[PDB]
């Protein structure tokens with residue numbers, strides 16, 4: 001299964017599934033600073049799933065590993081901003097992270113396998 005380009009549509013489909021998840025709603029668009037005035041005191045690099053989708057559609061990811069790094073930043077930002085492990089929004093982040101990691105593992109494996117096949121000779 002050695003298509004070097006297949007990851008892109010696989011990531012578009014997984015982002016579609018993430019946007020159907022009620023657990024993604026807090027992570028779809030940027031944090032408003034009027035509502036969370038200290039957010040940028042804690043978070044140096046904001047990230048959200050609309051920014052991930054637009055970067056993909058612009059042709060500004062070279063690999064699914066780069067997309068995976070930005071999605072993982074969404075979740076680490078939630079973990080750093082939460083005042084407790086038991087917050088609503090951080091609890092939604094943990095379920096959505098488990099869903100994402102379950103689905104991205106084959107996308108990464110197939111891509112890396114396809115690159116190794118390309119360089120086999």
Ligand SMILES: CNC(=O)N1CCN(C(=O)c2ccc(COc3ccccc3)o2)CC1
Nearest residue numbers: 026029030031032078081082083087089090
């Ligand atoms: C459009 N998206 C946003 O505005 N976001 C809000 C901030 N955020 C977080 O990841 C996060 C982690 C924990 C919390 C809030 O915790 C509370 C704790 C007790 C009472 C009320 C809230 O927010 C990203 C999504």
